[PDB]
Design a protein around this ligand. Structure first.
Ligand code: A0M
Ligand code: A0M
Ligand code: CO
Ligand code: CO
Lengths: 382, 382
C-alpha cells in the first residue's frame, strides 16, 4: 500500500555531505577506498575563504566533504558579501558538529522541483527550519530543515532542465577515473532514541509513507517518497537485551541521534567488493567479519533459484549477505565504521528483481539476515 | 664550529604526532600516500576511552595520528585513573589545537637518556613546561615543553636498552607491508613571526647550537644537537617583498606559529618519488610544480661530478631539486600541503657525501635552490 502522499514533488537523492575537520584527507581516503572520482571543488583556489568542499562522484552517487577554514580569513565578510559557496555553512555549527559527533553526515540532500516550496510546505507541516531558501546565481535553490540530531534534510532545485554555483570542475590530471561499480545512493539510515516521535515528525512534514516490510536490538521503519526512490529508514534501540544494542552504542559514541549508515547500490557487487577488499589494508575500508560457512551452505535452500552455485561461492569468498522478501532478492555487506568512532558505516547493496526500470526497495533491507546469522552461528558451532 | 653544548643527552628523533579530528582517515591516507605500515594502536579496542592513536612506521620514521573521543566516554575518570595511553593528552587542548590550526603537528618527539632530567634542565633554563615527566608502566618516561606556537618538544626516555605502554602491535592482516623507501626523519622546521626570540628560547633551554649554512621571503637558522642528528630549522617572514612571503601566508592560515614541514630521508629518492607520484591522484600526495628544463640543463655544471646524465634525467622526470654545499649534495622535493590549509607540507630528501655513517645535514637544506629556481625560470622564458 502506497498512498503517494508526498507534500511536494521529490525526485532523487542528490548528494550526501560529510562535515570534517580536514576535508582533503577524508576525501582522498574515501576516493581510493570506494572508487570515486574527484569531480568538483570549492575552496581557497576558487575564491572560497570560508570552507573547503570537495565532491566525489561514482555514477549518480555524490559525496561532498566540507571543513571550515580559520574564521579570520573571512572575518570581514557578511552574509550579503560571503565567499562561501554553500550559504548555509556556519563555522561554529561545523566545529560544534565535528567536536560533538566526530566525522559524519551533516546533510542528506534530495533534489526537488521547487526548494522554496518544499521548505515552506515542510515548515508549515512541522519541520524545524535550519537554513531558509537561498537562490544561488539565479540558477539553483537550496534550503535545509532538521531531520534528526544535527543532521539536516537539504532541498535542492534547479531551474535548468555543474554541482552548485561557485564550484569548479576538477582538472583531469588531478581527476583519476576510479570506478569500482558504485552507481547511486539507495537509502540513508538514522539512529534515534525514540522511533515513534522521529517518524511522526519526518512523515509529518514530508508526506513520506511507511514502506512495507517483509532480539536484534532495534526497532525500525522506513519512510519513502511517492515512487519509493528516496528511502529513509530510522532505528531505535531495544533495551534490556542480553547483547547490548548497537543502536544504543551508536547513540552513546555519537552523542545522540544521527546518520547510521549509507547504502550504496552497485551495478556489480562482486566487482565492487573485490576492488574494495583489495584496498582494505592499503588505505581503503574494512568489512565486518564474514558469516560462517553454514550461512553459505544454507544459501542453497533460500535463493538457489536466484543465484547459481558459482554465484553463491562468490558470495562466500567476499562475505556477501543475501536476503529476500516476496518481491525480490538483496545482496549486501557492511563496512566497519568509516572513522574513529563506532558510529557511521557504509552498506554496499545490489537488488535483483522487481522489473517493470527496477522498483524501489526491491528485496527489502535485509532484516532477515539478523535471525539467519544467529542460526548459522550456532549451526556452525556444531 | 660545533661547541657540543647540549644541556642533556639527546639521541635521535623518536616520533612526530599529528593532532587530528579523525585519526583513522588521516592515518589511512598517509599510509598509502607515503608507504608507511600500520604498526601500533591505542584506541577503544585497547581500552583507551580518551583518544584514538594510530602509529605508522617506515624504517625508523614514526608518525602518530591522534584524535579525541567524546569526553563523555571518560567523564568518570581522573588523571590517576585515566585510560589514555598518552597522559599529556587533553580533550580541550586537542580540539582547540585542531580548530585553531587544522591538521598539523602537535609534538616533535626526541629520544633522550633521561626525560625527567631533560625536562628539569630545560625548565631550569627557560623552557615553558607543557606536561611534567610521567613514568609509564615503570618503563618509559615522557615529558613535554613548549617549542613554538602550540607545538611541543616531547622528551621520551626508555629504561630498557613497544612504542609506548598501552599501545598494541597491529594484526598483520591489518598491517600491509608498504614501503616506498622512506627511512627516517631528517629535520623538522618551524615558522614563527620573529626568528631571533624563537632561537634564543629554544637554544636557551636545549643547548642546541647553530648549524653552519652554505629575496626568498624568509630568514632562517638551524639548531642542532651535539652530533647534529636532531635538526630544528626555524623560519621568519621577510616583509615588504614583491612576492608575498610564504612564511607570512603560513602564519595567517595557521593562526600563528607552528610546524611548517617535515623532511623525510629516503634511501632511494628515485624509488620514493616514483611510488609517491603514481599515487598522487589516487589518494596520495601531490608535489609542487616542477622546475623548467633549463634548471635541469644547468644541473650539468653544478653537480655533473656527482650524478650521471642518466641520474640527472631521472631528476628531471620526477621534478627533483638538487643543491650542494662545500661538504655534500642534496636531492629534495616538496609536496603540496598535506591538508586543507596552505600550511604544513612534506619534504623528501636524500643526502650524498660526508661519509666518516653519514654526518648530519650533509649538503645543507637547499637554500641555494631559491636563487637557482629564479634563474632557471627567467632563463627558460628566453
Ligand atoms: C550478526 C551481524 O549481522 C547482522 O545481523 C546485521 N544485519 C543487518 C541487516 C540489515 C541492516 C540494514 O541495512 C538496516 C536498514 O537498512 C533498515 C532498518 C533496519 C536495518 O538494520 C543492518 C544495518 C544490519 C546490521 O547492521 N547487522 C549487524 C552487523 C554487525 C554488527 C551488528 C549488526
Ligand atoms: C620557487 C619555489 O621553490 C623554492 O624556491 C623553495 N626552495 C626551498 C628550499 C629549501 C627549503 C627547506 O627545506 C628549508 C629548510 O629545510 C631550512 C630553512 C630554510 C628552508 O626553506 C624549502 C622549504 C624551500 C621551499 O619551500 N621552496 C618553495 C617551494 C614552493 C613555493 C615557495 C617556496
Ligand atoms: Co541498509
Ligand atoms: Co627542509
Amino acid at each position: 500500500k502506497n498512498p503517494k502522499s508526498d507534500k511536494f514533488k521529490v525526485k532523487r537523492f542528490h548528494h550526501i555531505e560529510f562535515w570534517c575537520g580536514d576535508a582533503t584527507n577524508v576525501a582522498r581516503r574515501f576516493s581510493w577506498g570506494l572508487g570515486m572520482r574527484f569531480s568538483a571543488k570549492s575552496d581557497l583556489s576558487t575564491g572560497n575563504m570560508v570552507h573547503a568542499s570537495y565532491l566525489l562522484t561514482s555514477g549518480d552517487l555524490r559525496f561532498l566533504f566540507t571543513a571550515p577554514y580559520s574564521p579570520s580569513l573571512s572575518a570581514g565578510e557578511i552574509k550579503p558579501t560571503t565567499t562561501a559557496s554553500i550559504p548555509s555553512f556556519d563555522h561554529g555549527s561545523c566545529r560544534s558538529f565535528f567536536s560533538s559527533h566526530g566525522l559524519g553526515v551533516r546533510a542528506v540532500a534530495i533534489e526537488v522541483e521547487d526548494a522554496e516550496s518544499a521548505f515552506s510546505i515542510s515548515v508549515a507541516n512541522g519541520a524545524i527550519p535550519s537554513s531558509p531558501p537561498i537562490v544561488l546565481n539565479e540558477a539553483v535553490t537550496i534550503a535545509e530543515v532538521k531531520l534528526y540530531g544535527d543532521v539536516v534534510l537539504r532541498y535542492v532545485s534547479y531551474k535548468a532542465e555543474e554541482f552548485l554555483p561557485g564550484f569548479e570542475r576538477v582538472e583531469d590530471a588531478s581527476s583519476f577515473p576510479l570506478d569500482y561499480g558504485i552507481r547511486r545512493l539507495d537509502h540513508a539510515v538514522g539512529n534515534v532514541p525514540e522511533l515513534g516521535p522521529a517518524l511522526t515528525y519526518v512523515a509529518g512534514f514530508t508526506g513520506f509513507h511507511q514502506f512495507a516490510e517483509f532480539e536484534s536490538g532495534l526497532n525500525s521503519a522506513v519512510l519513502a517518497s511517492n515512487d519509493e526512490m528516496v528511502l529513509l529508514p530510522i532505528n531505535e534501540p531495544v533495551h534490556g537485551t542480553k547483547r547490548k544494542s548497537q543502536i544504543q552504542t551508536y547513540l552513546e559514541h555519537n552523542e545522540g541521534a544521527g546518520l547510521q549508515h549509507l547504502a550504496l547500490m552497485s551495478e556489480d557487487i562482486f566487482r565492487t567488493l573485490r576492488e574494495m577488499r583489495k584496498r582494505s589494508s592499503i588505505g581503503g575500508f574494512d568489512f565486518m567479519p564474514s558469516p560462517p560457512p553454514t550461512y553459505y551452505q544454507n544459501l542453497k535452500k533460500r535463493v538457489g533459484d536466484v543465484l547459481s552455485d558459482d554465484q553463491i561461492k562468490e558470495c562466500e569468498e567476499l562475505g556477501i549477505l543475501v536476503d529476500r522478501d516476496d518481491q525480490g532478492t538483496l545482496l549486501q555487506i557492511f563496512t566497519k565504521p568509516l572513522g574513529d568512532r563506532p558510529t557511521i558505516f557504509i552498506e554496499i547493496i545490489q537488488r535483483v528483481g522487481c522489473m517493470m526500470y527496477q522498483s524501489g526497495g526491491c528485496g527489502g533491507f535485509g532484516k532477515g539476515n539478523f535471525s539467519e546469522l544467529f542460526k548459522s552461528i550456532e549451526e556452525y558451532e556444531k
